[PDB]
A paper describes a structure:
[name] bnAbs show outstanding breadth, neutralizing up to >98% primary isolates, but have uncommon features. Notably, long heavy complementarity-determining region (CDR) H3 loops with aromatic residues at the tip facilitate bnAb binding to the hydrophobic [name] and nearby membrane. DNA sequencing revealed [name] was from subclass IgG1, whereas most [name] bnAbs are IgG3s.
To gain insight into [name] three-dimensional (3D) structure and mode of binding, we determined crystal structures of unbound (1.4 Å resolution) and MPER671-683-bound [name] (3.65 Å) Fabs. The superposition of Cα atoms of the two [name] variable domains yielded a root means square deviation (r.m.s.d.) of 0.6 Å. Except for CDRH3 where residues are displaced by up to ~ 4.8 Å (i.e., W99), bound and unbound Fabs show only minor differences in CDR loops. Similar to all [name] bnAbs, CDRH3 aromatics were crucial for [name] neutralization, but the observed pre-configuration of H4K3 to bind the [name] and lipid heads on the membrane may explain its faster on-rate compared with [name], where reorientation of the CDRH3 is needed.
Residue numbers in the entry:
A (entry chain L): 1 to 27, 27A, 28 to 213
B (entry chain H): 1 to 52, 52A, 53 to 82, 82A, 82B, 82C, 83 to 100, 100A, ...
The structure:
């Protein structure tokens, strides 16, 4: 099973800059059978390069591919706004083709620390028998952020989920929402609910908290 | 131009089989490979198998052998995927993709033409509208407020604020699938703290599969 490993996981670059994306195969790719695809949210992938270096009709000339053996590259000579997307390589030299895990190519902008907000569960929801506690991280960059939930000083694990917006089309930031879900009985057993946020734009972690029932 | 047009999305129960069709028009059909590729939410594409229609030579990914069938009709230029024994690991968008043609028609193997995708969700859940709970603005500049849209099935829900009048600063997050099999999402907006006493904020939630509309007023919590 040929394994395709792409680098970097996230490539952060400026509009108009040159971009170089890498792919490495765990064994030599037969007949230069290496393709690159671009994918935008909600759309099918689009073939940019096939057989290592050939462009299909309709693909702009700023895209080029090179490589041989186990190491391949996709180069974008200058990044137009439409080129920020996820890119996958694919080997198809064997009878079981495989894709790499993708490189997210996103817009680099000035570091922005998140604004952090914590929301207690509504009294209405508590009647359903469940408590959702929400932490919002608003308009931050870069995308990497760490959110830890602490209940009466105990780090929570296994009982939260999060999701992240697409990079904002006007300001190039991200936002993130993390939800801690507890039974009502567990929620009323504890007092202090806190979300602790670590991010490159914060000089030390930010904690937002509330005391149940106050 | 080559167009690949797929059949519609569906919810399927665990243990069932699903058939997806792909009508290919405008280009070579029988002597090129059509492939099925799927992509689960948040994951990369995965090739499943392919067919060359002329004599229906097929190639199936090893992990799908026994559950996957690929077929083709040459008179109606349509390819089919049949996938049996469905489980939640089969929830994905399924695409048909045709190989490109190169120098004097040479098959390129790379996937040049793609269908629009068919969204298949494998679940035992019944259609269910969301509850809507407020994310109330803190008493303790800029304030954040929102709505938590919880426990619905299937996707999607849409959220607007003040009937569309408020769009600046809104973030409506991707849904998460909870361990109960129901989805949940939040929608938030940041606004001037000075507006909290004078401006009404209402989130308008629509879940078309259950014909549910909810308008929830979100206000600072009293006391």
């Amino acid at each position: 099973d040929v394994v395709m490993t792409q680098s970097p996981g996230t490539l952060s670059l400026s509009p108009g800059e040159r971009a170089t994306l890498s792919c490495r195969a765990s064994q030599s790719v037969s007949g230069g059978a290496l393709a690159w695809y671009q994918q935008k949210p909600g759309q099918a992938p689009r073939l940019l390069i096939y057989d290592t270096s050939s462009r299909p009709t309709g693909v702009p000339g700023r895209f080029s591919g090179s490589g041989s053996g186990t190491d391949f590259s996709l180069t974008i000579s200058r990044l137009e706004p439409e080129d920020f997307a996820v890119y996958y390589c694919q080997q198809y030299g064997t009878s079981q083709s495989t894709f790499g895990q993708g490189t997210r190519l996103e817009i680099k902008r000035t570091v922005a620390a998140p604004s952090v907000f914590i929301f207690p569960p509504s009294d209405e929801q508590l009647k359903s028998g469940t408590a959702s506690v929400v932490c919002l991280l608003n308009n931050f960059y870069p995308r990497e952020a760490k959110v830890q939930w602490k209940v009466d000083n105990a780090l929570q694990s296994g009982n939260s989920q999060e999701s992240v917006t697409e990079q904002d089309s006007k300001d190039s930031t991200y936002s993130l929402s993390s939800t801690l879900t507890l039974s009502k009985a567990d929620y009323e057993k504890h007092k202090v609910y806190a979300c602790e946020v670590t991010h490159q734009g914060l000089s030390s972690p930010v904690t937002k908290s509330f005391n149940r029932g106050e | 131009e080559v167009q690949l047009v797929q059949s519609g999305g569906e919810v399927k129960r665990p243990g069932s089989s699903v058939t997806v069709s792909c009508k290919a028009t405008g280009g070579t059909f029988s002597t090129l490979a059509f492939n099925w590729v799927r992509q689960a939410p948040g994951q990369g594409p995965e090739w499943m198998g392919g067919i060359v229609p002329l004599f229906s030579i097929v190639n199936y990914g090893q992990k799908f052998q026994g559950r996957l069938t690929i077929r083709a009709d040459k008179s109606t230029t349509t390819v089919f995927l049949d996938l049996s024994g469905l489980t939640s690991a089969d929830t994905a968008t399924y695409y048909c993709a045709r190989e490109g043609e190169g120098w004097f028609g040479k098959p390129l193997r790379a996937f040049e033409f793609w269908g629009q995708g068919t969204v298949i969700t494998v679940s035992s859940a019944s259609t269910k509208g969301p509850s809507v709970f407020p994310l109330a603005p803190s008493s303790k500049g800029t304030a954040a407020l929102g709505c938590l849209v919880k426990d619905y099935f299937p996707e999607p829900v849409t959220v607007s604020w003040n009937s569309g009048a408020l769009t600046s600063g809104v973030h409506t997050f991707p849904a998460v699938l909870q361990s109960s099999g129901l989805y949940s999402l939040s929608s938030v907006v940041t606004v001037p703290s000075s507006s909290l006493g004078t401006q009404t904020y209402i989130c308008n939630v629509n879940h078309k599969p259950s014909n549910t509309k909810v308008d929830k007023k979100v206000e600072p919590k009293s006391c």
